[PDB]
Design an enzyme around this catalytic site. Sequence first.
Site, PDB file in Angstrom:
ATOM      1  N   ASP A  35      -3.975  -9.528  -2.381  1.00 24.18           N
ATOM      2  CA  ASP A  35      -4.494  -8.497  -3.047  1.00 24.18           C
ATOM      3  C   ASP A  35      -4.691  -8.892  -4.458  1.00 24.18           C
ATOM      4  OD1 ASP A  35      -4.523  -6.193  -4.065  1.00 24.18           O
ATOM      5  OD2 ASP A  35      -2.456  -5.478  -4.254  1.00 24.18           O
ATOM      6  N   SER A 199     -21.201  -3.408 -12.516  1.00 24.12           N
ATOM      7  CA  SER A 199     -22.509  -3.422 -11.409  1.00 24.12           C
ATOM      8  C   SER A 199     -23.417  -2.896 -11.862  1.00 24.12           C
ATOM      9  CB  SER A 199     -21.851  -2.444 -10.368  1.00 24.12           C
ATOM     10  OG  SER A 199     -22.885  -2.587  -9.287  1.00 24.12           O
TER      11      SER A 199
HETATM   12  N1  U1H Z   1      -4.663  -3.294  -5.071  1.00 22.47           N
HETATM   13  C1  U1H Z   1      -3.872  -2.884  -6.123  1.00 22.47           C
HETATM   14  C2  U1H Z   1      -4.214  -1.953  -6.770  1.00 22.47           C
HETATM   15  C3  U1H Z   1      -3.561  -0.521  -6.511  1.00 22.47           C
HETATM   16  C4  U1H Z   1      -3.998   0.371  -7.342  1.00 22.47           C
HETATM   17  C5  U1H Z   1      -4.973   0.291  -8.284  1.00 22.47           C
HETATM   18  C6  U1H Z   1      -5.492   1.538  -9.076  1.00 22.47           C
HETATM   19  F1  U1H Z   1      -5.465   2.359  -8.321  1.00 22.47           F
HETATM   20  F2  U1H Z   1      -4.432   1.926 -10.068  1.00 22.47           F
HETATM   21  F3  U1H Z   1      -6.564   1.391  -9.459  1.00 22.47           F
HETATM   22  C7  U1H Z   1      -5.414  -1.001  -8.736  1.00 22.47           C
HETATM   23  C8  U1H Z   1      -5.225  -1.980  -8.011  1.00 22.47           C
HETATM   24  N1  U1H Z   2      -3.397  -1.949  -3.016  1.00 24.06           N
HETATM   25  C1  U1H Z   2      -2.226  -2.524  -2.801  1.00 24.06           C
HETATM   26  C2  U1H Z   2      -1.572  -2.070  -1.120  1.00 24.06           C
HETATM   27  C3  U1H Z   2      -1.919  -2.614  -0.237  1.00 24.06           C
HETATM   28  C4  U1H Z   2      -1.353  -2.385   0.903  1.00 24.06           C
HETATM   29  C5  U1H Z   2      -0.685  -0.927   1.379  1.00 24.06           C
HETATM   30  C6  U1H Z   2      -0.133  -0.260   2.482  1.00 24.06           C
HETATM   31  F1  U1H Z   2      -1.339  -0.004   3.351  1.00 24.06           F
HETATM   32  F2  U1H Z   2       0.436  -1.326   3.286  1.00 24.06           F
HETATM   33  F3  U1H Z   2       0.681   0.486   2.230  1.00 24.06           F
HETATM   34  C7  U1H Z   2      -0.689  -0.281   0.035  1.00 24.06           C
HETATM   35  C8  U1H Z   2      -1.045  -0.637  -1.250  1.00 24.06           C
END
Ligand code: U1H
Ligand code: U1H
Length: 330
Positions: A35, A199
Amino acid sequence: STGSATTTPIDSLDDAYITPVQIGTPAQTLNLDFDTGSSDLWVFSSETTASEVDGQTIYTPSKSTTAKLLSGATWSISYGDGSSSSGDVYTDTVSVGGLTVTGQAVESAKKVSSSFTEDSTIDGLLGLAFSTLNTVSPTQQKTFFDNAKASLDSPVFTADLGYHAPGTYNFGFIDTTAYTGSITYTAVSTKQGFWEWTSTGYAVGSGTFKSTSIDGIADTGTTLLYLPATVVSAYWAQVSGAKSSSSVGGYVFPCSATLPSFTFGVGSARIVIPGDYIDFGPISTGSSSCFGGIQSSAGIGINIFGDVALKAAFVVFNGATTPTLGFASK
Ligand SMILES: NCc1ccc(C(F)(F)F)cc1
Ligand SMILES: NCc1ccc(C(F)(F)F)cc1
């Protein structure tokens, strides 16, 4: 040193990708969601409330001879989709595709939200944003990438996600056989802790390219592409019968439609997302309404270049002192 690991979609829609990670001594292999939008390495464990575990592989620190409890440390995270988890903190040896880091903070979940419990294929997350977002208290912890940086041949990692197929995360080197043409690099802002870039515009199908600055984050942890309402409206206007559905929570379209491609700008270069990448299938089993892969960011507060966009490209995360993002076609 370098590391290389295969990443695999968890279902037929590419909702997420899991990568095997070795934790502890002897190795316990867990399948983690890499992530770039978060900065915690957390795992289901022997300390997770038993009712909140449904098929996940758990990390058992008591069976690892290198695991050490980080006295008094806790963590608590809340994701943008409303997901959350929390627990305590161990340090242990963590290896990804041959690349080993000793003394990595491994955050052991005592509680997880229901969306993680229901996702039997994801044993945890491996955060790859900047360490300033790490939630460990009272002593903030470094990410796997940050800990490995000094020993990497080059302070980079690359994401090569597959469309309905396995892909690769590489650490420490750029595979020049994995892309075509040149890599276009663009500036990154770290002021919010994300891989944040701008972008240079977009095009719908074979339409004119619209030069316009779109600030957003490169997030392998988010499935879809979240863009400003003006852009998303212009995309779905070209799909006959598509509409925004409040009950569904986004744009849906008749499953019999053909979707136009979507192009986004990286400097002077163009990345083309094939229309098939934007189809996320029926909203419910048997439905003839299908869910769209490009949705509005208006409710989120930030634009997110998630997997839908990233898997159309070879993506370089350059963690040099001045960080940059590289995009190439593939
Ligand atoms: N993948 C992690 C993540 C989850 C949420 C956000 C947000 F919504 F806050 F931009 C950024 C990054
Ligand atoms: N962006 C982070 C994230 C990744 C996976 C999930 C889920 F799908 F496993 F719930 C939630 C949040």
